[PDB]
C-alpha cells in the first residue's frame, strides 16, 4: 500500500539469485502491508536476504530459508520463528518479543534478551556464552552449543534443555522447574535444589562425569523411603 515499501520490495524482488522465490515473497509482503496482517510468513522460500519488514506485524515466520542476517525487527513483534537458516547473528530484539526460536543456525553470540521474553529456543547454534536471563522466562533451550557455563535461572523457569554442551557447574534450580534435560555435559555434581523439585518433575543427567560421592549422595536420597523429589535418570 505504502509506495515507499513497494519500491524497496520491487527492487529486492529483482535482485535475487535464481533459487530464491522472491516473487512469492514480494506478493506476500504487499498483501501483509495492504491488509495490515499480524503475521508475515516467508518460510520455506529459499531466501538469502529479507528486505525492510512491514512495521505492524506481531508474528514473523521465516523458518527454513537461507538467511545469514536479519533486517531491523519491527517493534510490535511478539513471536519470531527463524529456525533452520544460516544466521550468524541476530539484530536488537524488540521489547515486545515473547517467543524466539532461532535454533539450527550458526549464531555465536546473542544480543540482550528483552524483559518480556518467555520462550527461548537456540538449540544447534555455536554459542560460547549466554546473555543474562530475563525474569519471565519459562522455557530455555540451548542444547547443542559450545557453552562452558550458564547464567543464574529466573524463578518462573519451567523447562530447561542444555544437552551436549560443556557446562561444568549447574546453578541452583528453581522449584518452578518441571523438566531438566541435562545430558552430555561436564557436570561432576548436581545442585541440592534438584532433589527439591516436584515429585512429577523430570531430570535426565545421563552422560555427565558425576563423581562417586555425588552418586552415593543421590542414591541415598532418591532410594530412601520418604523421598518425594523428582525422578532422576542416570542413563
Partner 1 sequence: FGIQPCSICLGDAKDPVCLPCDHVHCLRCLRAWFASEQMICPYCLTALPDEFSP
- Nearest approach, Cβ of 141 to partner 1 (angstroms)? 5
- Nearest approach, Cβ of 161 to partner 1 (angstroms)? 5
- Nearest approach, Cβ of 88 to partner 1 (angstroms)? 20
Summarize as ranges the residues that interact with partner 1 (CB under 8 A).
84, 101, 103-104, 121, 123-124, 139, 141, 143-144, 159, 161, 163-164, 179, 181, 183-184, 202, 204, 231, 233
Which one, 65 or 184, has the nearer CB to partner 1? 184
Which one, 90 or 161, has the nearer CB to partner 1? 161
Which one, 17 or 200, has the nearer CB to partner 1? 200
Which one, 33 or 204, has the nearer CB to partner 1? 204
- Which phi and psi angles does 8 have, rounded to 5°? -60, -45
* Edge-to-edge strands, sheet with 59-61: 39-41, 59-61, 79-81, 99-101, 119-121, 139-141, 159-161, 179-181, 202-204, 231-233
DSSP run (H or E) holding 220: helix 212-222
Which one, 9 or 84, has the nearer CB to partner 1? 84
Asked whether the CA dihedral 86, 62, 81, 52 is positive or negative, the reply is positive
- Nearest approach, Cβ of 142 to partner 1 (angstroms)? 10
DSSP run (H or E) holding 10: helix 3-13
The pairing of beta strand 202-204 with beta strand 179-181: parallel
Report helix, strand or coil for 233: strand
Angle at which helix 3-13 crosses helix 22-34, to 10 degrees, equals 170
- CA dist 170 and 155 (Å) reads 15
- Nearest approach, Cβ of 205 to partner 1 (angstroms)? 13
Which one, 9 or 101, has the nearer CB to partner 1? 101
- Nearest approach, Cβ of 68 to partner 1 (angstroms)? 20
Amino acid at each position: 500500500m505504502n509506495e515507499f515499501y513497494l519500491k524497496t520490495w520491487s527492487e529486492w524482488e529483482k535482485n535475487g539469485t535464481p533459487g530464491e522465490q522472491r516473487n512469492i515473497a514480494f506478493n506476500r509482503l504487499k498483501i501483509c502491508l495492504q491488509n495490515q496482517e499480524a503475521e508475515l510468513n516467508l518460510s520455506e522460500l529459499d531466501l538469502k536476504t529479507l528486505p525492510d519488514l512491514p512495521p505492524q506485524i506481531t508474528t514473523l515466520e521465516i523458518r527454513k530459508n537461507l538467511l545469514t542476517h536479519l533486517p531491523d525487527l519491527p517493534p510490535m513483534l511478539k513471536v519470531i520463528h527463524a529456525q533452520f537458516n544460516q544466521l550468524e547473528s541476530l539484530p536488537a530484539l524488540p521489547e515486545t518479543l515473547e517467543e524466539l526460536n532461532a535454533g539450527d543456525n550458526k549464531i555465536k553470540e546473542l544480543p540482550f534478551l528483552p524483559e518480556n521474553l518467555t520462550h527461548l529456543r537456540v538449540h544447534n547454534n555455536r554459542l560460547h556464552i549466554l546473555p543474562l536471563l530475563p525474569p519471565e522466562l519459562k522455557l530455555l533451550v540451548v542444547s547443542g552449543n559450545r557453552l562452558d557455563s550458564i547464567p543464574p535461572f529466573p524463578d518462573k523457569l519451567e523447562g530447561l534443555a542444555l544437552a551436549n554442551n560443556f557446562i561444568e557447574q549447574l546453578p541452583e534450580l528453581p522449584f518452578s522447574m518441571n523438566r531438566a534435560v541435562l545430558m552430555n555435559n561436564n557436570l561432576t555434581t548436581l545442585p541440592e535444589s534438584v532433589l527439591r523439585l516436584a515429585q512429577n518433575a523430570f531430570v535426565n543427567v545421563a552422560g555427565n562425569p558425576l563423581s562417586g560421592h555425588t552418586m552415593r549422595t543421590l542414591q541415598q536420597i532418591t532410594t530412601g523411603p520418604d523421598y518425594s523429589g523428582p525422578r532422576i535418570f542416570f542413563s
